[PDB]
Amino acid sequence: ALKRIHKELNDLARDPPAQCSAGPVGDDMFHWQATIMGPNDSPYQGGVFFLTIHFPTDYPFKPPKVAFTTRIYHPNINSNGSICLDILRSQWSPALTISKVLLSICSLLCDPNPDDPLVPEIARIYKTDREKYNRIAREWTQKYAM
Amino acid sequence: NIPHGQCVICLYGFQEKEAFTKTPCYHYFHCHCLARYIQHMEQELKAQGGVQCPVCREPLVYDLASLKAAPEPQQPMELYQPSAESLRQQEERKRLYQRQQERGGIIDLE
Ligand SMILES: O=C([O-])C(=O)[O-]
Ligand SMILES: [Zn+2]
Ligand SMILES: [Zn+2]
């Protein structure tokens, strides 16, 4: 796993997905911190969001564990920062990379999947009152991530 | 000859002395890398019950023993050496993170 992790780390340092970064926490190559700039096509615009990544022993055959550290208001991300995203569980493949995972999370921020929520209340608001949803998502962004 | 691309499992390319294979879906992997993938996937499918190409999901035909027999590729670890620019950016990040902490914006998981 370590050689693969070093490869990715280098491939990310030189060509990160737009508006993202990621690298090790101190000396520990199996524990990374990443950042995503809130996409301009999302109510997270202007915010900077920190994530934690922990690689399993059998990486890249098992997915990395990825969670938000920065609080965020989103149907698919809960108060523990857990993220409901298929490629982080059933649809993981070693052909995927942290770079691709970050891009996928950016896409998720622009376009939630309210029919597979981690937070039913937010999912309800998203589906019934998008105006309210976007307002609250912006409000949390401004208070916590800006 | 030798493929010009990279084994998406290990992220290294192919070298003339390496054992690699090509799937019927036109994707190349080191034999060793693909063997590890298949072994893992076989265990996973069993624990819930058709190993697919990691790239395109086409079902693979293979003989695991034959892939395993092949020599593991010799690949030097790629050193991590952050540029001066990334170190600068990392410092700005620390500043942002500190503000988020102060705001109660950081999840603890006590
Ligand atoms: O969650 C909060 O505290 C907020 O929305 O003001
Ligand atoms: Zn390989
Ligand atoms: Zn394929």
- The structure class of chain A reads alpha+beta
Work out the helicity level of chain B.
Answer: 25-40%
Total number of helices of chain A:
4
> Gyration radius of chain A, to the nearest Å?
15 Å
What best-fitting shape of chain A do the alpha-carbon axes yield?
globular
> What is the helix fraction of residues of chain A, given as a range?
25-40%
CATH class identity of chain B: Alpha Beta
Shape of chain B: extended
- Give the amount of beta strand of chain B, in percent: 5-15%
CATH topology of chain B: Herpes Virus-1
**Ligand set:** oxalate ion, zinc ion
Q: What would you call the quaternary organization?
A: heterodimer
Largest sheet of chain A: 4 strands, antiparallel
Q: How many DSSP helices of chain B? A: 3
Family (chain B): Belongs to the RNF25 family.
Subunit structure (chain B): Interacts with UBE2D2, and may also interact with UBE2E1 and UBE2E3. Interacts with RELA/p65.
Protein name (chain B): E3 ubiquitin-protein ligase RNF25
Subcellular location (chain B): Cytoplasm
Furnish the topology, listing elements before pairings.
The complex is a heterodimer of chains A (146) and B (110).
Chain A: H1 2-14, E1 20-25, E2 28-37, E3 48-54, E4 65-68, H2 98-110, H3 120-128, H4 130-144
Antiparallel strand pairs in A: 1-2, 2-3, 3-4
Helix pairs in contact in A: 3-4
Chain B: E1 20-22, E2 28-30, H1 31-46, H2 64-69, H3 84-102
Antiparallel strand pairs in B: 1-2
Bound molecules: oxalate ion and zinc ion (ZN) (2 copies).
One zinc ion binds at residues 23, 25, 27, 53, 55-56, 58 of chain B.
In short:
Chain A: This is Ubiquitin-conjugating enzyme E2 D2. The complex is a heterodimer of chains A (146) and B (110). Chain A is of the alpha+beta class and 146 residues long.
